[PDB]
Design a protein around this ligand. Structure first.
Ligand SMILES: O=C(O)[C@@]1(O)C[C@H](O)[C@@H](O)[C@H]([C@H](O)[C@H](O)CO)O1
Length: 383
């Protein structure tokens, strides 16, 4: 890989700063957030970078009052290089005491589509969880009020503003389903122009002229809840999903006509956590980038890898992110999202956990923004 001859570049700093950190991220209304989790990042066709997250208002839990927040780079050309290159925190949607989350964006010409999940504020995945008013949640169920919804919002002004989210659950989530997830992380635009958004048990396929899409479900057998999608260099689709049990990623391949079986990929250990994947380039040699925690049991083993295979069958060892660690962000590791930047870097959002209450709800979570070039990956000491 000729990119391995270039000087290695990496830079890293916190982008979503939890309430306990200096200069914590707050909305202009003064609403702050205990934790930020569940990153998503895209480069728009202007070069601007849009970074999304869940702003978890009172604690780090997945339920309760959670708003879908974002930042953009201040210009289309600054590539997110420095902290001051990013705008202040904004909100896509925060209505009610509800959970709004699972940001799953895809760029489509001059429109950015953002899928997201939602649940009523009185419900959680497991039920019985304590809320700030002293009540306990109900368990997410198959009722309209109690089941996870799927929403879509759009921007046609480079992320500056977002349309009121539209509930797509009735057409883009299977009937009878209770829990659900879209992404989180990103969707893609295929070489043939369709949009593909990964979701629990299914892909969501957008067809139509750029910026005027209509969506349908591609139901999958054996897919995970938190999936990634990526058109590999051979032109095929690949789902690379978070497994149910800890162990390894679960991967399937196919086309818009259907995917083959999901199988455990023993080359990609995973602790049952979200991962991210990115088609980096089409020219020679074509590359797919993958990021996750490369450990069957912990989220603190973040690793970024390259595959040169046309089907992304094999990834290299790659680079452990801890080689370029940050010391004032807690313990890095968790969900991630990657984009290419205009200046030939990979930009990655990565969760980090201050862990002050260990795994309890009071531990503050923040999100790191990393940029690095291919050479940094290729030249890793164990690669
Ligand atoms: O960090 C996790 O592990 C998390 O809890 C965070 C997400 O907000 C949540 O929606 C998702 C879900 O619980 C699993 O995918 C099982 O359905 O996972």
């Amino acid at each position: 890989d000729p990119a391995g001859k270039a000087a290695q570049y990496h830079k890293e700093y916190a982008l979503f700063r939890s309430a306990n950190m200096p200069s914590p991220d707050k909305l202009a209304t003064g609403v702050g957030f205990h934790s930020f989790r569940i990153p998503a990042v895209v480069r728009t066709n202007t070069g601007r970078i849009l970074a999304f997250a869940e702003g978890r208002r009172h604690n780090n839990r997945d339920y309760g009052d959670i708003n879908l927040v974002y930042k953009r780079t201040k210009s289309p050309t600054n590539n997110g290089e420095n902290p001051t290159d990013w705008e202040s925190l904004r909100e896509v949607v925060g209505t009610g005491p509800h959970t709004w989350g699972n940001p799953t964006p895809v760029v489509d010409g001059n429109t950015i589509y953002l899928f997201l999940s939602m649940n009523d504020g009185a419900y959680s995945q497991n039920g019985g969880n304590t809320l700030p008013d002293g009540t306990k949640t109900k368990k997410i169920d198959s009722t309209w009020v109690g089941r996870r919804h799927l929403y879509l919002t759009t921007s046609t002004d480079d992320g500056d503003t977002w349309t009121k989210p539209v509930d797509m659950t009735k057409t883009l989530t299977p009937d009878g389903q209770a829990w659900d997830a879209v992404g989180p992380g990103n969707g893609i635009k295929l070489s043939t122009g369709e949009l593909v958004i990964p979701a629990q048990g299914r892909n969501i396929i957008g067809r139509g002229p750029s910026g005027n899409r209509t969506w349908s479900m591609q139901i999958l057998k054996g897919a995970g809840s938190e999936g990634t999608i990526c058109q590999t260099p051979d032109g095929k689709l690949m789902r690379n999903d978070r497994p149910g049990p800890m162990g390894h990623r679960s991967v399937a391949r196919g086309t818009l006509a259907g995917l083959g079986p999901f199988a455990t990929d023993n080359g990609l250990p995973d602790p049952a956590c979200q991962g991210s994947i990115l088609s980096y380039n089409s020219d020679e040699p074509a590359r797919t980038i993958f990021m996750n925690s490369a450990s069957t049991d912990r989220r603190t083993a973040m690793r970024v890898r390259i595959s040169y295979d046309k089907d992304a069958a094999k990834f290299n060892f790659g680079r452990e992110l801890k080689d370029a660690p940050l010391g004032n962000v807690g313990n890095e590791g968790g969900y991630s999202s990657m984009t290419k930047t205009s200046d030939y870097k990979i930009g990655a959002l990565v969760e980090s956990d201050w862990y002050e209450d260990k795994g309890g709800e009071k531990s503050h979570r923040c999100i790191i923004w990393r940029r690095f070039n291919l050479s940094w990956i290729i030249n890793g000491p164990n690669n």
